[PDB]
């Protein structure tokens, strides 16, 4: 029955998930644009900068 409810709701969830991912591409891009260049293990230098 879990197989059945997974199968019969697959298409709507797949379309909504693809569209929500395409929407959240902007959030990912602006977040990574606002982050510092230096990685988390070396971000103390950019933080003191």
């Amino acid at each position: 029955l879990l197989i059945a409810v997974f199968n019969n709701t697959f298409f709507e969830v797949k379309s909504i998930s693809n569209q929500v991912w395409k929407f959240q591409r902007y959030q990912l891009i602006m977040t990574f644009h606002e982050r510092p260049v230096l990685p988390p293990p070396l971000i103390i230098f950019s933080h003191m900068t």
């Binding site: 029955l1 409810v5 997974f6 969830v13 797949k14 998930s17 991912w21 293990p41």
Partner: protein, 243 residues
Amino acid sequence: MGRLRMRKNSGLKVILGILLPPSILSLEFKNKDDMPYMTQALIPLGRKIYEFYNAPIVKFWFYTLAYIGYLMLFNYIVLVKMERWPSTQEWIVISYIFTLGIEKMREILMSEPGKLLQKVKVWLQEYWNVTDLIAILLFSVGMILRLQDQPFRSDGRVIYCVNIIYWYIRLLDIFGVNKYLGPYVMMIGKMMIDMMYFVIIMLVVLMSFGVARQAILFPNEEPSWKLAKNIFYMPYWMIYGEV
């Protein structure tokens, strides 16, 4: 892509640019005024280096490589035994946790509202930020317990293992960038609700059988918490091919 032409076999070129700095200058950069997206409005070599290292794709891959190296190190410090004092790899991991916490604090401070409680609320509206704060606090308490003597060191190791569970689950954040893996991950998150309702019905049927079996096969039993364990133990593994 930032100020970079590329758009052909993505990912690999910026990975070789990151690992090999003399691979950066061999790439076709975009013009000075082709599409200048800005926030507030030897020299060519330095300009190319600055344009490469400020691109969001380069920053993403360089974050991803740092996270992968950190996860490999935290594997090395949980698998191998640890002495009274942390090793170099454990110090690098502790530094990673402390700097990631400082980064999340800076993200809290540099947000939209004025009042600090509003900033805290709009930052905790994301679930991944809440789990990040929880995991950083757990790493802090585990490391505090680990820097003491026995038996607190083993408790700190246990908390380290639970944290490694969390950081593997957080590797899906990096997987969220790929065009096929990200929709797959949030698709899984959608089917979790149906799984929960399934778990509710399984819990009812499982507890019925387990209570019946334990109360029939063991008539003379004292009040002990092992009965509750025996309710759940064998019926749960009977679902996965072990009768």
